Amino acid sequence: LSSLRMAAILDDQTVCGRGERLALALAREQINGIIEVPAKARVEVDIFELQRDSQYETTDTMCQILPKGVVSVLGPSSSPASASTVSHICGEKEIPHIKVGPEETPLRFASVSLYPSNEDVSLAVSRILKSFNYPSASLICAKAECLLRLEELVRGFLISKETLSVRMLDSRDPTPLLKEIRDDKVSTIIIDANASISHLVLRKASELGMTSAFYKYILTTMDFPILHLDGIVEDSSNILGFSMFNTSHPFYPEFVRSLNMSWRENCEASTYPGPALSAALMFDAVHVVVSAVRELNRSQEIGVKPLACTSANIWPHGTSLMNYLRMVEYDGLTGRVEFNSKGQRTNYTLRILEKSRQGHREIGVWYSN
Template identity: 75%
Template sequence: MPELPALLLSIYFRFLLVTVVTMPPSSLSQTPVLSSVRMAAILDDSSVCGRGERLALALARENINSVMEGPARARVEVDIFELQKDSQYETTDTMCQILPKGVVSVIGPASSPASGSIVSHICGEKEIPHVKIGPEETPRLPYLRFASVTLYPSNEDLSLAIGAILRSFSYPSASLVCAKAECLLRLEELIRRFLISRETLSIRMLDDNLDPTPLLKEIRDDKIATIIIDANASISYLILKKASELGMTSAFYKYILTTMDFPLLWLDDIVDEQSNIVGFSMFNTTHPFYLEFIRSLNLSWREGCDINPYPGPALSSALLFDAVHVVVEYDGLTGRVEFNSKGQRTNYTLHILEKHRGGHKEIGIWYSNNTLLMNSTSLDINVSETLANKSLIITTILENPYVMRKMNYQEFEGNEQYEGFCVDMLRELSDILKFTYRIKLVDDGLYGAPEPNGSWTGMVGELINRKADLAVAAFTITSEREKVIDFSKPFMTLGISILYRVHIEARLSPYEWYNPHPCLRERRDLLENQYTLGNSLWFPVGGFMQQGSEIMPRALSTRCVSGVWWAFTLIIISSYTANLAAFLTVQRMEVPIESPDDLADQTNIQYGTIHGGSTMTFFMNSRYQTYQRMWNYMYSKQPSVFVKSTEEGIARVLNSKYAFLLESTMNEYHRSLNCNLTQIGGLLDTKGYGIGMPLGSPFRDEISLAVLQLQENNRLEILKRRWWEGGQCPKEEDHRAKGMNLSYTSTQ
């Protein structure tokens, strides 16, 4: 017979049991009573205490027979056949033992896909319904005659469920770890969807030695945070155990397991508060018989098995229970039991579970119509469950006033060695989110820039390599960095500015030539005539310029002539000053540069920035012509105009003709400490400082909300005033243009 639709199977089953059992007594005298209904169950687990399948079959038989009452009741009998190995000969021989018994259906096997395919084919030829409780065979052969229905989720449904979880948690890329090559066919729909979306899915096969170490190291080196494991429960545990040894079960890694025995996995020696391990369960815990089923299995397990404690029911045992009951009811221990025209399970649910110490919790439900409903509590930010009592590694860099060592830091240990704006902010965040932390200085002393080989230096590199959980420093948010790491909301807004030293010039002041010790004269007893030819000419010139000539006339006649000359020069100079007044209404400070354009148009004053910082990246990627010229100059200048730290840049500003390009907040801080420094022009751009974390970090939203809370409470502004207003220099006034207060006094 061809592939049976589910409706025909349903009618066939009910005809055998339901209709016969519920016949009225008047019809029983005319109709032979069916005393028993015989089924065959093929088990591929020979151990008594393996998956509890024998116990489940016994419970199902007793349960279904107990509800059939009356003189015409029919008893259900289940014959158990063991399959020693997954081979064609063993399977065919087992079916030859089953067929003469006149069974109405064949159930199983659970974990032997090849044998299951042979059983389906033989049952199809003999027109005997086959209830499959294991994964679908791959590939499914359409030209063979099948009479089977599958209680296990179809391969397509499994792919859709995994894809829904990936979309729900916004995982852009993933790695698929396959225990067998058949997983490429089992998850064909998932792979196809990745190809359509052009997102990254790397596929790695487990070797014959079942050693996952090499492929896990490859995944770690590729910076892939989402890992899908397609394997049975035992191999999945082996992979997770090795991942834990490699440090790959932290909060940055997410695991999705395809095994339906996920609830049986005991992972207390692997998981911690930060682990993210998700799997599926088909158990309907609201079924009226569920608790009795668990209690009976647990009791039988303790009486007949030496293994303690009872790990819980395997999915195959529940599916066997439902397979026996499928002929008389449609709501089983694995949910609603319905089939489509292909004999595949439909109108059912998969429960999404997340492992934690001591068990698991349900975080969502996937429906077979490809609808995913996540629990709001699992998606909402729950600070007490996410960051509370967690210990984080904080990478940072020494930069005044953000992170500094205390003057006597040798007397302290750990976090107490440091102080600064970022240290105080980190302490505030810790108080809000209830986490602990350890401050660690970045190894290479850099913020982070890409290398030609694709790797990153500095704090960015440490976040990518999972050496740190957070980067708290004067860490600029850039688009290039956002591609490889995540940032919180900015905690400070700033821009690029120019730092230069104050221009020194002689002032028009009498103190420039004033003698501070006028009483100290040499040889006061020596007298000589001071009106030589030179002094006689110098005296009237000094009067004309309204300046003293250091020659003092003593004779009355000479003083009168001098007074007339001075009056004449006063009138001449006053007239000249009045005519020139209109042209002297604005004075400008003599500064060699006043804007980035001035810097780009000259070569006398060198300029540069910190090597490997965001400011260097800004000029390197800028498309503005002036900034491109500045970058070409800085890149080609020898010796290099780039510096390793802010302190080195400030030293070059003070000791040479050098303009330092740096963030405005640092500019403001250092100008408050050194009055010989000044800012030239305005800001070249606008950007912000943020807290960095690895890509896909679960802490991003929590940290961002805490930063916003500090801003709303004005705590960040208070911290900034504390560290920025401790300098001795007053705030600068705008020196670009000052009006002169001119007044004209009329004398008559």
């Protein structure tokens, strides 16, 4: 390899952007700026955008990637159907797919994921419930698939003396849903939704007087740190959730400041909420791929050829690289990155946060081990 090339697929239709493209560039720059002994091949990241909601588009994008000679494909972060199409094609060609968003809910060739598994999210929520003395609860789901995502927790409630009252937004305003929860007179409300939908639910809850001291909320979104509930919350609250960020990572300041400058070219600096987790996962993903490829390269000569959608040819090194990906131990923006036999993150933590008027406080940690 004259260069170590990977592809990344972005799907970002937000007004301000999540900054994944810049995050990828920052990882590449950081890695290429460190001259190693022996010298290593330059890292390249080819970036492709998804602008429609179309698996035709996603398939065509993969067909454009295969001829470029890549050692991995990253993402997309926020498009589960597209990520499944990517995983399938990557599996057929034996190119590693590096996943950076939620487990697809509900494949032979292996992939890895930097995003916490569904089981881990369930266990983290259950840890907070243990802290509440294992109460009855209500669950608000953005999508019906929540019962699958949270199957571990659901199975626990199904055999426990406590109850779980489940309600789906699917489809406009959560107010009638929240009024039913209020009538049940149960304190603990679990919200399984992305950040914007979670904000909407909390806003409507606040308006109904449901952010009083009686009620306790647990959110599943890993973008909790960017959820700003100004005007809803005081300096202390009962609104809990998670973060993966290690703000002490040596690159974290440059990362935040750089993404702030990314944000403030389409929007105002004052509205930058902090770095998006998906951007940090993409940064970390580049390092994981580079680490694995350089370790594989000590024991075997790695080459790439054009692959194609119109050929049954596979990448001969993909099986090997999947095993070396599973050997990676990397300290990233998102904490310790290591993988288990299923390609899932292991030996890591989630910080448990409580929302406040200006941001949050950390009040505990969930350990995957």
